[PDB]
Symmetry: C3
Subunit: 207 residues, 3 copies
């Protein structure tokens, strides 16, 4: 499954920071019950690859790795069973490797030079990151109107209040956010409710 | 003619999106009558290279291509007769190719690394894009005071109201804007009047 | 001395634009008397390498070069006696060269791709520049929370009022600023007082 398809499965891609492996299964189950099957587990905590291997066992879960900073990490996340890969930015190295490896990479962009490098490598789906701190929807629209063939997932500072505005733009296939898994102790009921709310967001884009 | 000379010809560089080839000659005539000889035709529409070939026949018109994403597009724009090339960002590839080809490229920058990559390739004139979404004049002043040898053309969200503020800064040679060719149906009188207005903007950099 | 140590010496790294070589010694003396020993002399003026050579003779001065755009300029700044190097951004070339040369480079980053390139080269201390124009503390926090191993010095639009907010974040080791050497005629008393004031900023990191 290529990255464009992953982006269309759900309106919101939860960005998970797993601080305790005990939380992995319940978080994943709650998200999936709520209709958010596509899970980005960030490689920001030491227990992240275990957490991935655990969520991967949850039926319906499409588990990816975030915070993939280089080819090494991408290779590790792959071995662990990740179906796609998110990185906060793009380097030529990470890109060339993802392409070579047929890996569904969703790399971060912040400006035209980033997208252009992406395009040169044969990539056309990017994470706009960190969205709210680098110009927000206005900045993304400017990029979208220049790179017509490109589609985005904005992440960074997006909330339940701002997500539907981004999703009204057809250049945006989904948004990333952590508001869906709050605090630090998992409340399966709260998570499932926030996920239901979020999985019902309308998108302009043909999903 | 090198890119610095192009930038000094006029205070405003119209950013044209030509949707109907019938409009190319009249738009170009109107702009040139108005004192805006330097025309950026964006490669955002299917008829853009024809349009360039038409405007190129207009006496006094200095026609360039915008939205040049890669070396392929640059080569095509060149074959078509473009005198200069604008891109929304800069890659090492597009840059090395422009330099090699002696093409007057005016590439987009959004931050210091972009400028630094430009400088390494032997380029010192950049488009700051999309200006109003990446910090505006305050951001551009910061860059300008660091890269003293560099000069800019900001494009992106600039209006008749903001253009003279950018043009007061001597690091700015001109600005790009699309306000000069409004709507989608050409009014030669309106265009010429808006161009006269804009061609009389004072610039610190050019008397 | 590596770059992480330079960053910890003082809370504020003055960013100096020396417009007149006569001003170099007095500025450096005043800053050092004020407890800001770490001086970044930007290579933005024609007299900057002379200025560096002068400030380098000032006892207690740790002099670096700023606005190092490439390997050539780094090598020149080195020859002139600089102990560390700051650049507004990072290129693979400048980075590879700094690493190869064991030079304490503090390069500018503005987004994740910049940091990622840094990390690939073995660097983990960056200047976030120009801070106030590319998202400020909020943007920096977003970066810091993604790149947990990295530490920053924000520069660009920082003031005495905002500097302590940045320094409360433990990902930030120090800030750069020019407010400490005002105007364009040096007032040794004003400079020393502003430097004392700035040298007493608390930092979460140190």
């Amino acid at each position: 499954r290529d990255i464009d398809s992953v982006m269309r499965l759900a309106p919101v891609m939860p960005v998970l920071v797993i601080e305790d492996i005990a939380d992995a299964k319940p978080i994943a189950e709650a998200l999936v019950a709520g209709g958010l099957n596509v899970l980005e587990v960030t490689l920001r905590t030491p227990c992240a690859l275990e957490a991935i291997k655990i969520m991967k066992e949850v039926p319906g879960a499409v588990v990816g790795a975030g915070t993939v900073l280089n080819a090494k990490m991408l290779d590790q996340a792959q071995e662990a069973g990740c179906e796609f890969f998110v990185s906060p930015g793009l380097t030529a190295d990470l890109g060339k490797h993802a392409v070579a490896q047929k890996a569904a990479l969703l790399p971060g962009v912040a400006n035209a030079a980033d997208v252009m490098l992406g395009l040169d490598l044969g990539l056309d789906r990017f994470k706009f990151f960190p969205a709210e701190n680098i110009g927000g929807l206005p900045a993304l629209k400017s990029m979208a109107s220049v790179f017509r063939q490109v589609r985005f997932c904005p992440t960074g500072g997006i909330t339940p209040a701002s997500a539907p505005k981004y999703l009204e733009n057809p250049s945006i296939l989904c948004v990333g956010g952590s508001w869906v898994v709050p605090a630090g102790k998992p409340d399966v009921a709260k998570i499932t409710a926030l996920a239901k709310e979020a999985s019902a967001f309308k998108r302009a884009a043909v999903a």
